[PDB]
Amino acid sequence: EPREEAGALGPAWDESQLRSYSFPTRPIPRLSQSDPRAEELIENEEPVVLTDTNLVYPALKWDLEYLQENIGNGDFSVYSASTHKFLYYDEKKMANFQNFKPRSNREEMKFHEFVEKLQDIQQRGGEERLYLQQTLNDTVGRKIVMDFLGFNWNWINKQQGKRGWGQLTSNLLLIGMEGNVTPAHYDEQQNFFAQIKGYKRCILFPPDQFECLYPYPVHHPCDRQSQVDFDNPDYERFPNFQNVVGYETVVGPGDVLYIPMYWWHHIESLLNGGITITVNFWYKGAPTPKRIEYPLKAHQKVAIMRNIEKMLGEALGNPQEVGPLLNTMIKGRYN
Amino acid sequence: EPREEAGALGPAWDESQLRSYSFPTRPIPRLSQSDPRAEELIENEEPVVLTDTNLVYPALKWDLEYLQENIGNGDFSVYSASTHKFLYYDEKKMANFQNFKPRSNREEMKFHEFVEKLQDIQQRGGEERLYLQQTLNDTVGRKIVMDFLGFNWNWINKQQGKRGWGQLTSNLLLIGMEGNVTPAHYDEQQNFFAQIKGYKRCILFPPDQFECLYPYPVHHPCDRQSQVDFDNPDYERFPNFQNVVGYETVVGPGDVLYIPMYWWHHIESLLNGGITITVNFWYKGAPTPKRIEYPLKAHQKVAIMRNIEKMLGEALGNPQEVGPLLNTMIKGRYN
Ligand SMILES: O=C(O)C(=O)C[C@H](CCCc1ccccc1)C(=O)O
Ligand SMILES: O=C(O)C(=O)C[C@H](CCCc1ccccc1)C(=O)O
Ligand SMILES: [Zn+2]
Ligand SMILES: [Zn+2]
C-alpha cells in the first residue's frame, strides 16, 4: 500500500496511478540498510528496497532546470515512441533480423534540446513520449561531478566487496515522462537502482519464471526482453504467462532497489506522476566458482541456455538456422 | 530385382523373402570395383554395392562346420530374442535409464555352444531367435588367421588411404538366422560391409532424413537407433516417418556394401534364406578440416546436435534433465 509523505503531505501516490495487469504480485520488502534481513536478501540474490542508504543523496535536488545548467554539453540518447512502451532493442543485432523495425526512435541530442522538445510536447498537448537513457560520462559539468562524487561510495563499495562482484560497469541516467513503461526484461549484471525524482512501480520475476516470460531469441535485437505484451497477453502463444507471479514495489526519491542479476523486471513511471529520474549502478556478477555445486540455480540454467543458442549460431554460421535445428533435435525425441 | 545365379541355378532370392514396409525405396547402384562411378560414389559418401572386390574371398568357404573347427575357443557374444528384431542397446548407458529393459538377452558362449543351441532350436521347431555378433580378435585359430590374412587388404587399404580415413577400428563377425532384423540405426564410423553367406536386404537412409527417423536421446542405451517401429509406425508420435525414402539392395556372397558414416541402415536376413554370415570393416572418418566450408553437410548438423546433447547432460549433471531444458529453450521462442 502507499507510503505517507512526512509533514502530513498526504500519500505520495495512490493505486489509481498503477497500470492494470493479469497476474498477481506480493510486495518486495522495504528495509533499512542496517537491517540484517536486508543484508541476507542481497546475499541470497533476492530483491529488497533499501530506504536509507543515502546512495544518491546529492542528486535528490536534481530537476530539469538544474541538470540543463550543469550536466554539460555532451550528447544524450533520447528515445521517442507513439506508445507508452519503450521496448529495448540492441542495434548491434538488427543485422541478424532485417525484418525487425523498432517502435522507439533514438535521437542523439543536447540536454537543452531534450528539455525543449519536452516543453513543445507539453505546450501543444501532444501524445508523443520521450525517454532519456544515457550513461554518465566525463562530459558532465563540474557541479554534476561534485554531486556524483558525493554519492555514498562507502556503502556501495562495501556491498560490491562483500558480494564478490566485479567492477562498477556504468551508471545509467534515466529521465522519463509519466506513464512511460520499460517492458519486462532481465539484465546480466547486478543492479542497484537509485530513485531520485518521482515514483516508479517495479515488478520483478525470479529467474525460475523463464518459462512463463518467453524471451526473444538470443540473436534477436530484443534478446533478454519478454515477448509477451503485458497489456494484451497472447495466451495461445504464451500459455505459461498464466502462471506468472511478480514481486512489486513503488520506489520514490531516496529509495534504492536491488535488482539481482537475471531477475526479470518491468518498470513503469506512475501515471500522472510527473517526470521521473533514476540512476542505476551496474556491477558484473561474482565469478563462477571453480567447483560447481549441484543443484544448479535457476540463473545458471538460463546461462546455459544462452550459451547453447550462441554456440549453435556460431557453429551453423547463421542465427536464423538456430530455431530449425533445435526443433529438429527435440521433436519426437524430447517432447 | 533379383539377380540370377551362375550356372542357370535360378534366382538366388525372390521378392516373397522381403518384409513389407510403409515407405518407398530406389535401388543402390551395384558396380565393379574398377568402375569410376563407384569411386566417385565413395568419394562423395554415397552408398554403393561393389560386386568384385574379393575383399573376403577366403571367407566365402565359411560355414558353421568350418568355423566351429577353426575359430578357436574364445567367447562369442550371442543375442537371443522372442522377436525378429534385434534392437542394439549400449549396456554402458543403461544406468542413465534404469527403466529400460532390453528385449534381446546377451549370452557369452563358446562357438560350439552357439552351434548346439541353434541345433536344439531347429530340432524342437522353436521360435527363439539367435544372432551372434562378435569382434574378431587374437583368439581365433590358425586357419581363420590364414583366411583373415588373405582378405584383399591391398584394395581396402587404398580406399582408406584415398579417403583420408583413420585406422581400421574392428571387424565384426555377424551370424544370424533367416528373418533376423537389425532395426534402423546409424553408426559414426565408415563401413565396408562384406557379405559371406546367405542374403541380407539393406535399406539405407541419408543423414538428411534425421527428422523422419527419430533417434533415441544420446544418453539412452538406444542412442543412434530409430525409435520408429518399422512394422507398426506410430504416425502420431513420428509424423515425418511418412516422408521417409530409402535406398535398397540385397547383398549376397561376394558383395561389399559401402555404408557411409551417419547413414541410417536397416538390415534384414532374407526370410527362409538360411543362416547369414557377414563381416564388417569399420574405419574412423577423416578428420574434420581446419577451415569449415559452409554450407554444412547433413552429417555435420547431426554431429552438432549430438554434441549439444552431450554437453547439456554434462553441464546439468543429469541426462534426465536434458529434455526439460531443451523444451524450456524452444517453447514459445523457436517454435
Ligand atoms: O536500471 C534498469 O536496469 C532498468 O531496467 C531501468 C529501466 C530502463 C532500462 C532500459 C534498458 C533496457 C534493457 C537493456 C538496457 C537498458 C527503466 O527505469 O525504465
Ligand atoms: O555392420 C553394421 O554396421 C550393421 O549394422 C550390421 C548389422 C548388425 C549391427 C549390430 C549393431 C547395431 C548398432 C551398433 C553396433 C552394432 C546386421 O548386419 O545385422
Ligand atoms: Zn533492466
Ligand atoms: Zn550399423
Author numbering:
A (entry chain A), B (entry chain A): 15 to 349
Study authors write:
2-Oxoglutarate (2OG) and Fe(II)-dependent oxygenases couple substrate oxidation with 2OG decarboxylation to give succinate and CO2; they have important functions in human biology, e.g., in hypoxia signaling, extracellular matrix biosynthesis, lipid metabolism, and DNA/RNA damage repair. The human 2OG oxygenases studied, factor inhibiting hypoxia-inducible transcription factor HIF-α (FIH) and aspartate/asparagine-β-hydroxylase (AspH), catalyze C3 hydroxylations of Asp/Asn-residues. Like AspH, human factor inhibiting the hypoxia-inducible transcription factor HIF-α (FIH) catalyzes the post-translational oxidation of Asp- and Asn-residues in a 2OG-dependent manner, however, to give the β-threo hydroxylated product. FIH was initially identified as catalyzing hydroxylation of an Asn-residue in the C-terminal transactivation domain of HIF-α isoforms (Asn803 in HIF-1α), a reaction that suppresses HIF-mediated transcription.
FIH crystallized in the P41212 space group (FIH:11, 1.99 Å resolution; FIH:18, 1.90 Å resolution). The analysis of the electron density maps for the 2OG derivatives indicates that only (S)-11 and (S)-18 bind FIH, even though both were present as racemic mixtures. The conformation of (S)-18 in the FIH:18 structure is reminiscent of the NOFD conformation in the reported FIH:NOFD52 structure, indicating that these molecules inhibit FIH by a similar mechanism: their bulky phenyl substituents extent into the FIH substrate-binding pocket and appear to shield the active site metal from the substrate and/or O2. In agreement with the proposal that the coordination of (S)-11 and (S)-18 to the FIH active site impairs substrate binding, FIH crystals with both inhibitor and substrate-bound could not be obtained. To investigate the mechanism by which the synthetic 2OG derivatives inhibit FIH, the concentration-dependent effect of the potent FIH inhibitor 18 on the 2OG Kmapp-value was investigated using HIF-1α788–822. The 2OG Kmapp-value decreases in a linear fashion with ascending inhibitor concentrations, while the vmaxapp-values converge, indicating a linear 2OG-competitive inhibition mechanism. Using non-linear regression, the Ki-value of 18 was determined to be ~0.2 μM. Notably, 19 inhibits FIH more than one order of magnitude less efficiently than the structurally related, but conformationally more rigid, NOFD (note that NOFD was used in the enantiopure form, while 19 was used as a racemic mixture).
